[PDB]
Design a binder for this molecule. Structure first.
Ligand SMILES: *[C@@H]1O[C@H](CO)[C@@H](O[C@@H]2O[C@H](CO)[C@@H](O)[C@H](O)[C@H]2NC(C)=O)[C@H](O)[C@H]1NC(C)=O
Ligand SMILES: *[C@@H]1O[C@H](CO)[C@@H](O)[C@H](O)[C@H]1NC(C)=O
Ligand SMILES: *[C@@H]1O[C@H](CO)[C@@H](O)[C@H](O)[C@H]1NC(C)=O
Ligand SMILES: *[C@@H]1O[C@H](CO)[C@@H](O)[C@H](O)[C@H]1NC(C)=O
Ligand SMILES: [Mg+2]
Ligand SMILES: [Mg+2]
Lengths: 617, 366, 704, 233
């Protein structure tokens, strides 16, 4: 007498999307039909199938739908929706779902990051799964190349001898998709210098109101190994947006001896130029190093940028904890502490003095703090501060948030909380999961099973059932963490009460970002005569297609910002996630909405529409 | 809606270029490259609109400033000195700006086989206002061919002169000019450069220039050949090498002078061996050397000469056959007729005749 | 005169030229005389410096290994391996980057003449208006944009000269102007087979035909250089070449208006196109047979300009005539490029070009209406100069340089042979498709079931010549031309003197004297591109093949083929279903005594006392390490032909019989072999009564 | 005389900024831990530097994977290092500074020639290379300036060769020097609005843009015209 449909809040093209159909208070084997039509006019049948739901599969099926892009192409924007329908004996469910054309995540590799007029730009496009449009834009934003490319053969782009200088863009997109991956590359009339210059700052930050000086260590090496010897010029300044304001009196000439030099900025010289501290808030301190060989033969210009001028060495973030609690239950607070640039910060102790709860951050810069919420409270102010043994109380960071209470349906006082103790979670790990229930006695006896979803990369990946032997206030389940769950995954779980009320919760879990497979280039590591025979071993997964490239360290040292990395890849995935929050919700419907899910029930409990696929900022 | 047809006709080809622009590809810019400044005819049939930008790139003359030290004045001289080879190097410089120039750099290269006098250099490095990277010393010479001196500043009002001795380490054939660059931290681009050499004013390698076409003039001077007897068999072979174009007897009419160059105007009296120049006797032949070579040559007006040269050395002078005098050019004094009597020249003139004849009559042996 | 002391040469030899006014050296194969091939006499008593290309002294003249040029740049891909230089028979491979397709020869092998096999490899993105011109191995290319009207320039590593276009422009047509460049050493040469193919391939289009326009006409100007530099011998030899060129051309149906000019200090005209006769090939051939080298001896300079102006005279007109822009012009120049009077010959071409309206319209090239071919006599050729004269046409070669005046005759002699009659003995036309058997048509595999696999040569349409020791006692089969099909044979003809047991009495097992046999097939053979006869000693076919008069005796042939010296010969060996020419030397001079003496080391002869017992006047002898290390035969090669490759033809002089050491493993190499491992061959000259007899009714036509 | 013969010295020339743009497939049998290992051979270019090899694999179940870079360090004991500017002006005398790097732990006596190139005026000539001879302390660098005057426009090779006396140590470098003509590159801009429809239903615009007037132009240099067309949004 209760039927539920649950699908990803956003469906991707042109790839496999698992959905969820459930029968509660029923056990009569059925035959459900699954239709996917365009919306609104339902002019055609995009996908269709028939499915068997019986007590063997616990009255619960996971069909795979697939929406071809040939069939719903309409160069509209404003956009497109489709409609999922489930029909059967006594089962009539349907959900209008938002449609996305990004069939999967694309990434672009160019051979070099910097080019000369009149040379070829070689490139590849990669897909996370297995058509595509590739576009070239001039630094003036003009489109000069548009091609439909095959995923295993690309045409090199050739810069004219009279090319336009500046930063160029390569754009890869699926046709109709307003979403795009974008690589950059510079075209400069430029000779690659014969040596690299590496910069190492004294501190990761600069106290806006401090007393200490600031050092920048310099290292210079010829690209073949040995140490550069010469002279360096360092000029400091403050970067306000992109307007640089220099500290002229800071200009120092410095000897490079055995490749090493050390340039200093006096707090004196800094105070003299920027007396009013107000002008310095939220801005960064930079250093423009300029090294010359002793022979006058060559010169390199680097820059140390993005040294934030701050009041504290740390930032506190509540971006990784739920903004909703469950009265009378242990709330799980996950503090995120970063350095001023945004990187994780390990071994930082934190405290919430209101709850006298302590904890230090781990390698990912997080600390899980358990708080015991009073049985009655509805609003909940949480303040957290850093407590590092090396800082005066005045240099500690602090942040506040407010968590609201999860609204029960009909005011039942029926709750569900999912908890996970483990931290720094890697693939291979086995993970204890905890289903905790609190509420009405007449209700907690009807709970006969928990349904859970394992959401990863915008997609339902696995669904399961956890039995609950009557009386069990706490039910533990194991969960193997496989390379499929990188970069992170969501655990959404709910239970039903009297075929009417839905009580639910969700958790966001982070996984150690690496490769799902392996790839390692191995060599003997000896020094080489020019034009010598070389042998290198490629080690990776069976059936791997490996793209190679050799780059002079003269470039590759240049424009690190533009190079592709394993990290840049995962950050794109994560920014593209359809779930917008760290867990829970204002209420049952809010738990799904926030986890990037859609639900419709036979009682007509419906997750609201989606106003765009990107999550609010 | 938008749907435009384009035809672009260019005199450089027959097949014209056809384009179709519409909604699906209007963001895309269509480009056509040609290497000619000729008429372009464009037609357009259809519905939509479009902007056609025609960009012509050429090389334009600039106001006669070339390298011109824009930010500094730089004077580099060098003079010989008594030291019982070795010279004194004076470098004067001044920032042309509104204020003294922060962190200035004086880049210096040595003449071939010269090094900076150790003591004089050590005396230069001394100062709270200076820096010179470390240098080793042997035989009282700083073992640095490139010597950079980093100054904390340089005046914009008064010139700032500095000098040191340079000494001859290894003794080589030709002395390459040295150079001096000047620049500062806030001015690392249009580097001011002067050259210097003991034998040269501006320290410039010897070249000759008609317009924008320059040829290497050589470092050694070319001189009048003088045998007092001609080995006709062998003198013949020499004029019959594969890179000898012609062999003339000439008379020297005038000596005109343009831009520090000597134009020796020859009239061709006899074609001893026919060269490419099909009708040489009807034209005046200009032979060009630089003035600093007046005396090594020693050509005198209204004398006769046996001149034979190489096609390569033909110069792009309009409406005038011109040659550059080279080591690939042979010039010998040809005794006048009223001179052949004087015993001083008798048998020389005979070998001269037995030469002009054997060639104009039989040609080369091979 | 000059003293012949100190004129040695490691692992090699030499022979005096011009009575002794300019000697010259001879190396094996894949070896070149360092530093110079010839010296010139100084009136001091000593021949000359041992300088070089550059001007520095060397102290012991040697035969170096020929080297193939290392790629300077290969665009858009990698090549394997990278060596400082490449040895003969070395392999180099080319692979392309992602996004680029390889045109040209993916793999390339270094050939015995310093040239790479196949054509120039190129990695192309197919994006240029034209293709990627590529970088011919040995050159350096400037310019990487291949849009319409772009140019690329080529130059060669200093010490080499460029052949072809130094600059090429992308044209409306889609092709590049000029012709693909290549790099040339002082020692590199064109084999006559290459020149023959290259020239006709350019001169005509394809059984070939000369392409005239409808109601058109052709004018051929033969300009010969007669300056002192050429020499007398090397002159009348070029006169011969032009004779054969006259025949060859005439046989292409079209009657061309000829022109004949020899030159030196001055040009002398021997035939003008304007004349009503021209066209008579007998008239012109007669005028040509007239010319003597003493016609220029007096004024013996090299004024090439005047010589071409002569041709510019025969082209000009009063008003323009009728059928002028319809006549094809073709210049054949035979100089050494060493012009030294008159100036740059080129200025006359550019004069002619404007007279024929050539290259004066972007809607009409008219490039077809002029061809200039230049043939370089031999060492002391200025390749820069004979190149700037020759036409530069895409995909065709117009400039040639050959080892000696001998080889240049070989060119035109081989043209009259393409010419036809596949029944022509020992004739192999070098088609570039390699294809094994195409290069040794006469080869016959043999198998006698029992098993045994000998070799043989196809002498007539009925007969196969082989060794007699392969048989004793339907049971036997022959296979040819790479034909699986094995042929029925009628009867074996042993030589009447042959007897493998002739001296089993004296404890000497096998006695290989008179070891020859003929196999008459049951079915006549039909010749073809992969089945031809080979020449036999003492036939009219051979006298003709050697370029001799019908009044040539049998002894004169022997004195020509098997002289008392070290003779350059070759046999055919099968190494894994591929046929290769192994080059050996017939020790017939001072070394002949010691070659035979190695007979008593051969198996079985442990009891042999005087080698005259087992080495008879019927045997020739090869193998060993003097003068050079010669490859050896195998059991599987036994019976095969021992060939001499003279004047562009293949004459069999012997039959492979026995060896002193089994050097075969199989495989063969060893890699190194005893110095005493000689090979003995039946000298066909010593079995002529028996040959003439059994082969009387066969069309071979013997002599004495 | 003690030195290595020029012809024996092969100059380095092949200095690509990037190469080995290839793709390979991991087809080999996996091992105990499910990893397929593929040996791969290739030859290095001429650059004396460190090459960085970057791999990026994709499999159908394991997505994209970027490998940590394998570095290759290439170096000679004795060698020339030549830094060229992006370009030099025609006819205008410039200094080129080479550097002899001795990384042998002993003092050496070297010979350095500049090769003759007709595109340049310099100390070298068709008959006589410009030769210097000098010592170098154990492990020192040393600068060697070369003064030259570009005479032709385009890309032209500068080749320097060095050899150590009484030893087998030699190096040569051949780099390309970009030579642009005198003056400043300007450009004329003509704009034309294409609207055929503005002339009726059967609309044609015919625009004759004649040869552009540009009489500042240095004679005998290349002219390049670009005709660009953008569509209306
Ligand atoms: C052809 O033969 C020569 C040997 O004379 C090879 O020369 C190589 O380089 C030098 C000169 O002998 C030696 O040090 C090497 O041993 C030779 N090769 C090796 C083994 O590295 C030359 O390499 C050969 N051609 C090839 C194989 O490219
Ligand atoms: C790529 O996405 C963003 C969306 O703002 C933007 O840079 C641009 O509109 C897109 N690029 C395209 C459509 O080529
Ligand atoms: C340098 O220039 C100054 C003028 O500012 C002049 O007085 C001096 O003589 C010059 N020195 C030279 C020519 O070296
Ligand atoms: C080139 O050679 C290799 C082996 O040497 C071979 O695998 C490849 O197929 C060859 N390519 C050809 C024949 O073009
Ligand atoms: Mg993660
Ligand atoms: Mg001659």
């Amino acid at each position: 007498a209760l039927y539920t449909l649950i699908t990803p809040a956003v469906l991707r093209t042109d790839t496999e999307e698992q959905i969820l159909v459930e029968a509660h208070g029923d056990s009569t084997p059925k035959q459900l039909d699954i239709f996917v039509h365009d919306f609104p006019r339902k002019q055609k049948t995009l996908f269709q199938t028939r499915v068997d739901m019986n007590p063997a599969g616990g009255m619960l099926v996971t069909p795979t739908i697939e929406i071809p892009a040939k069939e719903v192409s309409t160069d509209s924007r404003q956009n497109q929706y489709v409609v999922v329908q489930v029909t059967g004996p006594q089962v009539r469910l349907e959900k209008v779902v938002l449609l996305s054309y990004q069939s999967s995540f694309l990434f672009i590799q160019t051979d070099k990051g910097i080019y000369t007029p009149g040379s070829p730009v070689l490139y590849r496009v990669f897909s996370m799964d297995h058509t595509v449009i590739v576009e070239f834009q001039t630094p003036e934003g003009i489109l000069v190349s548009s091609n439909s490319v095959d995923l295993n053969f690309f045409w090199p782009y050739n810069l004219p001898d009279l090319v336009s200088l500046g930063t160029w863009r390569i754009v890869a997109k699926y046709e109709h998709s307003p979403e795009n991956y974008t690589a950059y590359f510079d075209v400069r009339k430029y000779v690659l210098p014969s040596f690299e210059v590496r910069l190492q700052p004294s501190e990761k930050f600069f106290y806006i109101d401090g007393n200490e000086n600031f050092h920048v260590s310099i290292t210079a090496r010829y690209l073949y190994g040995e140490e550069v010897e010469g002279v360096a010029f360092v000029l400091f300044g403050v970067k306000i947006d992109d307007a640089k304001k220099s500290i002229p009196d800071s200009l120092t000439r410095i000897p490079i001896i055995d490749g090493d030099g050390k340039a200093t900025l006096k707090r004196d010289t800094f105070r003299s130029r920027f007396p009013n501290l107000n002008e310095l808030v939220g801005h960064t301190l930079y250093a423009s190093v300029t090294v010359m060989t002793e022979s006058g033969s060559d010169m390199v210009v680097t820059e140390q940028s993005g040294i934030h001028i701050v009041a504290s060495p740390y930032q506190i973030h509540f971006t990784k904890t739920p903004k909703y609690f469950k009265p009378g239950m242990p709330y799980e607070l996950t503090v995120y502490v970063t350095n001023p640039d945004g990187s994780p910060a390990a071994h930082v102790p934190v405290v919430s003095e209101a709850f006298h709860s302590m904890g230090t951050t781990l390698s990912d810069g997080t600390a899980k703090l358990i708080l015991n919420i009073p049985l009655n409270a509805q609003s909940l102010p949480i303040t957290v501060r850093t407590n590092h043994g090396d800082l005066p109380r005045e240099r500690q960071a602090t942040k506040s948030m407010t968590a609201i209470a999860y609204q029960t349906q009909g005011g039942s006082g029926n709750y569900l909380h999912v908890a996970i103790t483990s931290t720094e979670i890697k693939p291979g790990d086995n993970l204890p999961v905890n289903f905790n229930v609190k509420g009405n006695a007449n209700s907690l006896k009807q709970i006969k099973y928990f349904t859970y979803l394992i959401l990863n990369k915008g997609k339902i990946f696995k669904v399961g059932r956890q039995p609950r032997r009557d009386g069990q206030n706490l039910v533990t389940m194991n969960l193997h963490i496989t390379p499929d769950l990188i970069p992170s995954f969501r655990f959404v779980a709910y239970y039903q009460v009297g075929n009417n009320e839905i009580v639910a919760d969700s958790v966001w879990v982070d996984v150690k970002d690496t490769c799902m497979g392996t790839l390692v280039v191995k060599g003997d590591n000896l020094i080489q005569m020019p034009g010598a025979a070389m042998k290198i071993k490629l080690e990776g997964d069976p059936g791997a297609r490996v793209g190679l490239v050799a780059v002079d360290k003269a470039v590759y040292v240049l424009n690190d910002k533009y190079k592709i990395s394993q990290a840049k890849i995962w950050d794109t995935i994560e920014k593209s996630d359809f779930g917008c929050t760290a867990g829970s919700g204002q209420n049952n419907l809010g738990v799904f909405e926030d986890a990037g899910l859609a639900l419709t029930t036979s009682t007509n409990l419906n997750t609201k529409q989606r106003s765009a696929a990107k999550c609010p900022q | 809606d938008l749907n435009l047809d384009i035809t672009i006709e260019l005199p450089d080809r027959e097949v014209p270029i056809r384009y179709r622009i519409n909604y699906e590809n209007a963001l895309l810019a269509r480009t056509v490259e040609t290497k000619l400044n000729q008429d372009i005819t464009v037609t357009a049939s259809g519905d939509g609109k479009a902007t056609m930008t025609i960009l012509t790139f050429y090389n334009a003359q600039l106001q006669e400033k070339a390298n011109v030290c824009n930010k500094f004045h730089l004077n580099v001289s060098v003079e010989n000195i008594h030291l019982n080879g070795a010279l004194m190097l004076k470098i004067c410089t001044r920032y042309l700006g509104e204020v003294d120039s922060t962190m200035t750099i004086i880049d210096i290269s040595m003449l071939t086989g010269f090094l900076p006098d150790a003591e004089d250099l050590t005396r230069l490095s001394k100062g709270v206002d200076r820096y010179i990277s470390r240098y080793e010393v042997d035989n009282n010479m700083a073992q640095k061919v490139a010597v950079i001196i980093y100054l904390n500043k340089v005046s914009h009002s008064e010139d700032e002169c500095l000098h040191f001795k340079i000494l001859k380490h290894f003794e080589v054939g030709f002395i390459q000019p040295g150079s001096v660059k000047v620049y500062s931290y806030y001015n690392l681009d249009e580097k001011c450069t002067k050259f210097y050499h003991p034998d040269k004013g501006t320290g410039l390698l010897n070249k000759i220039c008609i317009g924008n076409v320059c040829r290497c003039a050589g470092e050694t001077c070319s001189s009048l050949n003088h045998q007092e007897r001609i080995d006709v068999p062998l003198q013949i072979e020499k004029a019959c090498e594969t890179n000898v174009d012609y062999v003339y007897k000439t008379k020297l009419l005038r000596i005109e002078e343009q831009d520090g160059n000597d134009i020796y105007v020859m009239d061709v009296l006899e074609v001893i061996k026919q060269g490419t120049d099909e009708n040489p006797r009807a034209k005046t032949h200009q032979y060009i050397s630089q003035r600093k070579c007046q005396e090594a040559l020693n050509l005198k007006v209204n004398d006769d000469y046996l001149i034979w040269g190489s096609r390569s050395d033909l110069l792009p002078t309009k409406d005038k056959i011109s040659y550059i005098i080279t080591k690939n050019t042979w010039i010998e004094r040809w005794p006048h007729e009223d001179e052949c009597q004087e015993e001083e020249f008798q048998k020389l003139c005979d070998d001269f005749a037995q030469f002009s004849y054997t060639l104009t009559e039989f040609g080369c042996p091979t | 005169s000059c003293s012949l002391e100190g004129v040695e040469i490691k692992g090699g030899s030499f022979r005096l030229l011009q009575e002794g006014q300019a000697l010259e050296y001879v190396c094996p194969s894949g070896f070149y005389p360092y530093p110079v091939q010839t010296r010139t006499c100084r009136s001091t008593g000593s021949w000359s410096t041992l300088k070089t290309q550059d001007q520095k002294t060397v102290r012991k003249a040697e035969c170096r290994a020929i080297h193939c040029p290392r790629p300077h740049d290969f665009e858009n891909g990698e090549y394997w391996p990278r060596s400082p230089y490449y040895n003969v028979s070395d392999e180099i491979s080319f692979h392309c980057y992602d996004g680029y397709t390889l045109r040209g020869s993916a793999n390339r092998t270094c050939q015995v003449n310093g040239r790479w096999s196949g054509q120039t490899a190129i990695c192309d993105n197919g994006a240029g208006y034209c293709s990627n011109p590529g970088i011919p191995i040995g050159t350096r290319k400037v310019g990487s944009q291949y849009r319409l009207e772009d140019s690329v320039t080529y130059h060669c590593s200093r010490g080499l000269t460029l052949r072809g276009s130094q600059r090429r422009t992308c044209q409306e047509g889609g092709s590049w102007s000029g012709t693909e460049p290549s790099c040339q050493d002082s020692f590199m040469y064109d084999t006559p087979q290459e020149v023959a193919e290259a020239f006709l391939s350019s001169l005509t289009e394809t059984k070939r035909k000369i392409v005239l326009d409808p109601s058109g006409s052709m004018n051929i100007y033969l300009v010969l250089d007669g300056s002192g530099s050429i020499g007398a011998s090397d002159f009348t030899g070029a006169k011969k070449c032009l004779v054969n060129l006259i025949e060859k051309v005439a046989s292409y149906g079209v009657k061309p208006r000829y022109g004949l000019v020899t030159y030196a200090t001055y040009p002398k005209i021997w035939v003008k196109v304007s004349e009503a006769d021209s066209s008579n090939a007998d008239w012109v051939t007669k005028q040509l047979n007239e010319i003597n080298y003493e016609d220029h001896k007096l004024k013996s300079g090299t004024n090439t300009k005047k010589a071409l102006q002569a041709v510019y005279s025969m082209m000009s007109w009063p008003v323009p005539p009728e059928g002028w822009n319809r006549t094809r012009h073709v210049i054949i120049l035979m100089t050494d490029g060493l012009h030294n009077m008159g100036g740059d010959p080129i200025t006359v071409i550019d004069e002619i070009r404007d007279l024929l309206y050539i290259g004066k319209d972007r809607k009409n090239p008219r490039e077809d209406y002029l061809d200039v071919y230049v043939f370089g006599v031999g060492p002391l050729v200025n390749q820069v100069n004979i190149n700037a004269l020759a036409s530069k046409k895409d995909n065709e070669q117009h400039v040639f340089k050959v080892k000696d005046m001998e080889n240049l005759e070989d060119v035109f002699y081989q043209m009259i042979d393409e010419s036809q009659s596949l029944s022509l003995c020992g004739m192999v036309w070098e088609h570039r498709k390699g294809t094994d058997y195409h290069k040794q048509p006469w080869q016959a595999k043999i198998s006698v079931i029992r098993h045994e696999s000998c070799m043989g040569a196809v002498v007539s349409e009925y007969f196969v010549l082989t060794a007699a020791h392969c048989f004793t006692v339907h049971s036997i089969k022959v296979s040819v031309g790479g034909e699986k099909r094995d042929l029925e044979i009628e009867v074996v003809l042993f030589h009447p003197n042959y007897n493998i047991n002739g001296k089993k009495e004296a404890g000497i097992p096998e006695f290989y004297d008179y070891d020859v046999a003929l196999i008459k097939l049951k079915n006549k053979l039909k010749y073809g591109q992969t089945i031809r006869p080979i020449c036999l000693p003492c036939t009219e076919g051979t006298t003709r093949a050697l370029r001799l008069p019908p009044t040539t005796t049998c002894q004169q042939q022997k004195e020509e083929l098997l002289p008392a010296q070290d003779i350059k010969a070759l046999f055919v060996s099968e190494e894994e279903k591929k046929l290769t020419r192994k080059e050996v030397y017939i020790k017939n001079g001072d070394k002949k005594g010691s070659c035979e003496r190695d007979a008593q080391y051969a198996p079985g002869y442990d009891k042999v006392k005087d080698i005259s017992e087992v080495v008879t006047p019927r045997f020739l002898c090869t193998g060993g390490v003097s003068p050079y290390a010669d490859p050896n035969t195998c059991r599987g090669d036994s019976g095969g032909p021992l060939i001499v490759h003279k004047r562009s033809r293949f004459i069999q002089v012997g039959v492979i019989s026995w060896g002193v050491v089994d050097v075969c493993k199989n495989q063969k190499r060893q890699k190194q072999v005893p110095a005493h491992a000689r090979d003995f061959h039946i000298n066909l000259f010593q079995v002529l009564p028996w040959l003439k007899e059994k082969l009387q009714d066969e069309d071979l036509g013997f002599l004495a | 005389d003690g030195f290595i013969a020029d012809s024996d010295i092969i100059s380095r020339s092949d200095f690509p900024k990037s190469w080995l743009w290839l793709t390979k497939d991991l087809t080999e049998e996996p091992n105990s831990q499910g990893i397929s290992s593929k040996t791969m051979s290739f030859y290095l270019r001429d650059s004396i530097t460190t090459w960085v090899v970057l791999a990026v694999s994709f499999t159908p179940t394991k997505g994209i994977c970027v490998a940590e870079p394998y570095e290759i360090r290439v170096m000679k004991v004795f060698f020339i290092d030549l830094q060229m500017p992006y370009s030099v002006v025609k006819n205008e005398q410039v200094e080129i500074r080479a550097i002899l790097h001795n990384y042998v732990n002993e003092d050496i006596y070297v010979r350095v020639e500049l090769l003759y190139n007709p595109a340049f005026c310099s100390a070298s000539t068709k008959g006589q290379r410009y030769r210097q001879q000098f010592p170098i302390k154990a492990l020192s660098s040393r600068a060697v300036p070369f003064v030259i005057v570009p005479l032709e426009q385009g890309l032209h090779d500068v080749e320097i060769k060095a050899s150590v006396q009484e030893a087998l140590w030699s190096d040569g470098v051949r780099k390309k020097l970009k030579v642009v003509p005198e003056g400043v590159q300007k450009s004329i801009v003509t704009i034309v609005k294409l609207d055929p429809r503005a002339k009726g239903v059967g609309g044609t615009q015919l625009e004759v843009i004649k040869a552009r007037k540009l009489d500042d132009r240095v004679p005998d240099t290349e002219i390049e015209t670009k005709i660009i067309i953008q569509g209306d949004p």
